[PDB]
């Protein structure tokens, strides 16, 4: 039995970080031998050397695309635009983060504007909270009235992805795995 990691990691086109794609994995043998280019592999709270021999209830695969400078924000207890308003990990996070450069796929000479991130948000984000609304942000006492003028801006800002940009600004495909152990009989066992 094979867990559907092929669809997760080798997806043709990922989603923006403001609306990140969550996939639930259960009832399959989870083998991490598949995770075998130049990528970052950070595991929090678990021993990465024996993820294959570790049996637990649910796997949550969350996939999103961010810049290279924002990869370090995907970690427990980190503060930043992505962490605060787009995607936040909890303090006690039992899982792993996998990020790899994707300049070949998610960049074009004209510029890639299919990816967006939430810039303006009144409050912070609870862990694993998804903010999809696109209402105009009120930065002043005057109403936005559904119009985007002074002190009333669209909350979603597009990324600028070009092949000629530096490594820090290049698009990075990030997949974070959240492992959940439940009192109910687990059904993900490598």
């Amino acid at each position, epitope marked *: 039995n094979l867990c559907p990691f092929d669809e997760v990691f080798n997806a043709t086109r990922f989603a923006s970080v403001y609306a990140w794609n969550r996939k639930r994995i259960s009832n399959c043998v989870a083998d991490y031998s598949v995770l075998y280019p130049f990528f970052t592999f950070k595991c929090y709270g678990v021993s990465p050397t024996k993820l294959n021999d570790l049996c637990f209830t649910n796997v949550y695969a969350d996939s999103f695309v961010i810049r290279g400078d924002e990869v370090r924000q995907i970690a427990p207890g980190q*503060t930043g635009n992505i962490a*605060d308003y787009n995607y936040k990990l909890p303090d006690d996070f039992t899982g792993c983060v996998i990020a790899w450069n994707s300049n070949k796929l998610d960049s074009k000479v004209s510029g890639n504007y299919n990816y967006l991130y939430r810039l303006f948000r009144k409050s*912070n984000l609870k862990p694993f909270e998804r903010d999809i609304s696109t209402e105009i942000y009120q930065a002043g006492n005057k109403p936005c009235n559904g119009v985007a003028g*002074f002190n009333c801006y669209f909350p979603l*800002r597009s990324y*600028s992805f070009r092949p000629t940009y*530096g490594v820090g*600004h290049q698009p990075y495909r990030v997949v974070v795995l959240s492992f959940e152990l439940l009192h109910a009989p687990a059904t993900v066992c490598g």
Partner: antibody
Amino acid sequence: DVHLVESGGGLIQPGGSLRLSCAASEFIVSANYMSWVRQAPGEGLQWVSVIYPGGSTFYAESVKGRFTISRDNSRNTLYLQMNSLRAEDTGVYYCARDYGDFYFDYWGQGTLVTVS
Amino acid sequence: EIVLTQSPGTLSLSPGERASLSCRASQSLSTYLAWYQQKPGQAPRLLIFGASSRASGIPDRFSGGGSGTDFTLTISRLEPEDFAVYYCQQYGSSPRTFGQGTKVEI
């Protein structure tokens, strides 16, 4: 009424503490990226600190652990508490509205802090 | 901390029609640079953001264009009000570093 007005600057003996206030009109400080930028006399600009709408705060590497940025939503004021002031902190401080964390759209008139 | 260097320390033109200010970055910024103008004894005023986009209220005489490491700010006609100090600021990385400033004279 887009004005930003700063106050609280003045002469302080080194190692002393001083609190700067930035009163804002037509700006909701709780809903905006606010920044403090200082200019030494006859020198270039140097960003000091920024506070996010959510509450996250960041400081320049030369001022962390001694400068604290804060906001009061009731009086719509931006505060900057600077403790253990050194002689290189002298200059004119500005409160600015940072569009996101990119650039400062508006600037206050600035107030002068002189360390002895 | 991308050190930002402005090639002309001072720039002395008659109040006619020409101006050019260059800002160079150590590593690439990718159109993440802004231009401010500081009149003497006054707060800085934002002119250009995104290295090519004007802000509200600044007239058509101000234009800017650049990408990567070299950025340029030009003034169509140099009206007397434009004789001040100009700064190039970056937001590609943290922190937001400024240039030394370029002062325009008559």
